[PDB]
């Protein structure tokens, strides 16, 4: 749905070792099968392929099985002008079996909504519209928050995409906080735990799972979206959660049949040794502590942790080569108590 980024974007991806999966500018829906559209698209594909085919970061081109666009026009361009890269004609509880039973090895995670940082709300909303509740009614959004939910045409209605925010907060924390700052932290915490769970769930299911690309790191406009950082650079709570589960060597906990499985995932070509410690936040009881060997380019099971009582949150402290890395795991079933969850994150000392 986006334009083709210019040369400098690929230069930074080349410099910082970030592989690029490039879609052709095609949106949701089927397109024309006639000569005029094919010729206009062939001219575009040939131009963009010759311009970008020299960047090492670029690794793939991407475009019912009779679509001339994806199965002919775009494929012929790649066949003649870039035979070195593959071409792929591809055209509310986060622990629901809808997510946890995805059969795809390479997943495009849908992402979870999250209210931006308060500074962004006061910058893109009118002073009277900073508070989301119209006339103070908990359940209703004003006309401005509905606009920042992407209402393409000014059709006055109530509900829709904006309900995705309060629904997620209600599933995890029971009720929707009336206070604005209590709502921002709650909605950001839901997005933070949900997105962290997806990355940990796919890293922990290797070698069958081969990749995960989530929606998304940054917004292109001051909006209420499922991105983890806004247009003005405001990193949401999810950004920091994802950062700790994106490490080259990450110790994480996955749900198991009769408890939890402590594991370590290696996204490098080198082996590593370390020591991991698992403790409960509130009680401080050490659940597990021992040495692990993280073999290269694979995930390794460390130990099966016994099931804990009720709700709570665990602390995963692991040291590799004299560097202390940290992670956590929220155990129990929702709804959780927002003040109690805030106490767990505070006592843990990983985030703020």
């Amino acid at each position: 749905g986006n334009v083709y980024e210019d040369t400098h974007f690929f230069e930074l991806c080349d410099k910082y070792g970030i592989m690029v999966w490039q879609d052709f500018a095609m949106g949701c829906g089927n397109y024309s099968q006639r000569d005029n559209f094919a010729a206009a698209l062939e001219k575009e594909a040939i131009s963009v392929v010759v311009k970008l085919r020299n960047h090492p970061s670029l690794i793939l081109w991407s475009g019912p099985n009779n679509d001339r666009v994806s199965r002919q026009v775009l494929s012929r361009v790649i066949y003649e002008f870039d035979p070195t890269r593959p071409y792929l004609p591809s055209s509310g509880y986060y622990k629901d079996p809808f997510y946890t039973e995805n059969p795809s090895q390479f997943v495009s995670q849908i992402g979870y909504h999250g209210c931006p940082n308060r500074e962004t709300l006061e910058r893109m909303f009118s002073p009277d519209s900073v508070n989301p509740w119209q006339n103070g009614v908990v359940g209703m959004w004003n006309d401005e928050w509905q606009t920042k939910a992407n209402r393409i045409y000014d059709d006055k209605f109530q509900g829709g995409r904006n309900d995705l925010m309060t629904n997620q907060v209600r599933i995890i924390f029971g009720e929707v906080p009336a206070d604005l700052d209590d709502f921002i932290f709650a909605s950001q915490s839901v997005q933070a735990e949900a997105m962290k769970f997806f990355v940990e769930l796919w890293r922990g299911r290797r070698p069958y799972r081969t990749g995960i690309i989530w929606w998304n790191i940054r917004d292109g406009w001051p909006l209420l979206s499922d991105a983890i950082s806004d247009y003005w650079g405001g990193k949401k709570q999810a950004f920091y959660y994802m950062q700790n589960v994106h490490h080259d060597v990450c110790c994480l906990i996955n749900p198991a049949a009769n408890g939890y499985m402590l594991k370590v995932d290696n996204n490098t070509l080198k082996d590593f040794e370390g020591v991991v410690e698992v403790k409960d936040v509130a009680s401080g009881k050490q659940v597990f502590k021992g040495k692990f060997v993280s073999k290269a380019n694979q995930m390794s099971e460390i130990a099966t942790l016994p099931m804990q009582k009720g709700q709570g949150m665990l602390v995963i402290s692991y040291r590799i080569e004299g560097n202390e890395y940290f992670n956590h795991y929220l155990y129990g079933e929702p709804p959780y108590k927002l003040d109690q969850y805030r106490k767990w994150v505070k006592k843990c000392g990983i985030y703020e």
Partner: protein, 377 residues
């Protein structure tokens, strides 16, 4: 009606191609070049050696001394008397071979633009020809420089065939191979003639052997005939088909032309099948078709060619490497023939001399007793 030949002595003016190639007569005459006598059909290198301007490229390293001329232009020019054309008749200017990218002018009017040295080129000059002396001008540009009008795909670069050969329709071996030298050359390397066609004329006579029975000396032959036929001539012209061999007429069939395109099937008796060497005789029959006026008896056109009653089928292997190269056998007239023969490479780097070597070269295969020959791409 007639075929006047334009072969013979022409005027050849050559000069280095400028940044903007010369496409017009004015620019060709304005360019500073050398004018020498030329022979058609011919190659420009032959005309310059006749003028004492280039050494014999067949001797020593003289072949490399033709390198600068790959970026030259070649201006053929001659006059010709116009044949007599009556109402409805068409005057066609026929080129057997233009090498390669040329603009053809007749009396200062562009009648065509050529860009393929391997096929014939025919232009209708009926409306541009004048009574008396006419002028014919052909301005050829550099074939090598023509390649830079294209952007090659990745797979077109680095192959054994020259990159200059990829985007143009020329013989790839002319750019250099391991068996044939690099000699791009240029010129009118085949016949140039003037053809007069009646309003009633044969467009194509396609002979097809449907079936053959060599034992019973029978064959079913089809004639796919396409003609140009004015509607005033519908039902007034007849097609006269004639099959003969060694002067003896085998069949004479007549049919009224009620359409411009018809299919004629002939069930023949006492006819021998065409066989490759060793497997029998290469029996050929003269197949002639003429469009004749039913009333006046005027013969409007006649197409004659020697055909052979033969069927070919390629039986592909389905067990020992099915689909891999070489896993097939030719089935001629129902029999599995064993093919033994040679590959056909260019007869001459200057291809206008090809026709002068065909007789000797084919006779080599006859002495060798080749029943097959593959004409190399």
């Amino acid at each position: 009606v007639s075929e006047q030949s334009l072969n013979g002595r022409w005027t050849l003016k050559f000069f280095p191609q400028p940044a903007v190639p010369v496409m017009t007569i004015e620019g060709a005459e304005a360019a500073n070049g050398i004018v020498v006598d030329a022979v058609v059909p011919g190659n420009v290198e032959i005309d310059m050696e006749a003028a004492g301007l280039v050494e014999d490229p067949m001797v020593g390293n003289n072949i490399y001394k033709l390198r600068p001329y790959e970026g030259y232009q070649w201006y053929y020019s001659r006059t010709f008397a116009a044949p007599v054309v009556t109402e409805g008749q068409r005057l066609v200017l026929h080129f057997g071979g233009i090498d390669t990218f040329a603009e053809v002018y007749v009396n200062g009017i562009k009648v065509g633009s050529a860009d393929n040295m391997l096929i014939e080129h025919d232009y209708d000059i009926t409306s541009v020809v004048k009574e008396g002396e006419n002028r014919l001008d052909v301005i050829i540009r550099s074939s090598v420089m023509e390649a830079q009008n294209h952007f090659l795909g990745t797979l077109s670069i680095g192959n054994f065939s020259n990159e200059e050969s990829a985007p143009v329709r020329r013989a790839p071996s002319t750019y250099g191979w391991d068996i044939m030298p690099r000699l791009v050359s240029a010129g009118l390397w085949r016949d140039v003639t003037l053809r007069v066609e009646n309003p009633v004329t044969i467009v194509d006579a396609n002979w097809v052997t449907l079936s053959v029975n060599p034992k019973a000396r029978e064959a079913s032959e089809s004639l796919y005939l396409q003609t140009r036929l004015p509607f005033e001539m519908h039902d007034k012209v007849k097609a006269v088909i004639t099959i003969s061999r060694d002067g003896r007429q085998i069949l004479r069939k007549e049919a009224l032309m009620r359409k411009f395109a018809n299919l004629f099937t002939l069930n023949l008796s006492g006819v021998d099948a065409w066989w490759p060497r060793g497997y029998g005789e290469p029996a050929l029959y003269t197949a002639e078709v003429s469009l004749v006026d039913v009333t006046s008896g005027k013969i409007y056109d006649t197409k004659t060619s020697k055909i052979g009653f033969r069927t070919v089928k390629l039986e592909l292997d389905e067990v020992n490497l099915p689909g891999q190269p070489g896993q097939f056998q030719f089935i001629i007239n129902g029999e599995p023939v064993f093919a033994k023969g040679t590959n056909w490479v260019p007869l001459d780097a200057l291809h206008s001399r090809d026709a002068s070597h065909v007789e000797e070269a084919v006779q080599l295969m006859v002495e060798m007793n080749c029943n097959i020959v593959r004409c190399w791409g």
